[PDB]
Amino acid sequence: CQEGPRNCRELLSQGATLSGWYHLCLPEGRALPVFCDMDTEGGGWLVFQRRQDGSVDFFRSWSSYRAGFGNQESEFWLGNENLHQLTLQGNWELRVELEDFNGNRTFAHYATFRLLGEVDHYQLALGKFSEGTAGDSLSLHSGRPFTTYDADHDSSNSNCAVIVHGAWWYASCYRSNLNGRYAVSEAAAHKYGIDWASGRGVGHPYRRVRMMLR
Ligand SMILES: C[C@H]1O[C@H](O)[C@H](O)C[C@H]1O
Numbered sequence: 001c002q003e004g005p006r007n008c009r010e011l012l013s014q015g016a017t018l019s020g021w022y023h024l025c026l027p028e029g030r031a032l033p034v035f036c037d038m039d040t041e042g043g044g045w046l047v048f049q050r051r052q053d054g055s056v057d058f059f060r061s062w063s064s065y066r067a068g069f070g071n072q073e074s075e076f077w078l079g080n081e082n083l084h085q086l087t088l089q090g091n092w093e094l095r096v097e098l099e100d101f102n103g104n105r106t107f108a109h110y111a112t113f114r115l116l117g118e119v120d121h122y123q124l125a126l127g128k129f130s131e132g133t134a135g136d137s138l139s140l141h142s143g144r145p146f147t148t149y150d151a152d153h154d155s156s157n158s159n160c161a162v163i164v165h166g167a168w169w170y171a172s173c174y175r176s177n178l179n180g181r182y183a184v185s186e187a188a189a190h191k192y193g194i195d196w197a198s199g200r201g202v203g204h205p206y207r208r209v210r211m212m213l214r
Pocket residue numbers: 164172173174175192202
């Protein structure tokens with residue numbers, strides 16, 4: 001791509017008012033299919049992660065997390081390199097949306113979100129918590145490198161990704177684990193699941209999750 005829209009706000013501004021899959025032209029001149037939410041909170045949100053049904057396996061390698069994986073019509077991880085490139089310029093606010101098995105929605109908002117490069121293991125650079133009924137469960141993870149089952153960078157004597165079955169900016173191990181193993185009900189819940197500590201707490205998973213930037 002020579003050029004095209006740099007982000008979902010630009011798309012909205014030019015009259016793309018329906019949420020859905022669009023192409024962004026990234027700073028290096030590469031076109032990237034992304035999901036834009038044009039409707040929630042004024043719209044213009046780049047949805048980079050979504051859990052909905054357990055249809056997609058989230059227990060994936062460093063390379064899969066780097067490049068992205070999943071299905072456009074359901075669950076996906078956009079990819080760490082994409083997120084690093086997107087967030088190299090500009091301030092992007094993070095909105096996390098969580099929905100439990102009862103359909104109760106709760107949200108968390110952080111002022112900025114940025115990923116460092118692969119050399120720094122896509123370390124998370126997270127702004128301060130602004131508001132959210134779900135509470136703050138990502139602050140712990142700021143300043144921490146990403147780890148996967150084949151790339152242990154956490155602060156644990158073991159590999160947190162293996163132990164807890166996911167991929168995240170693990171410490172030893174987490175306050176949030178949104179890329180963790182899917183569970184279709186509280187009865188099928190895993191020891192460590194799609195957890196938000198300040199929300200429903202560790203071991204008490206959610207039914208739907210999105211992470212998104214604007
Ligand atoms: C071993 C450890 O794993 C994570 O950090 C959980 O949040 C709490 C705990 O059980």
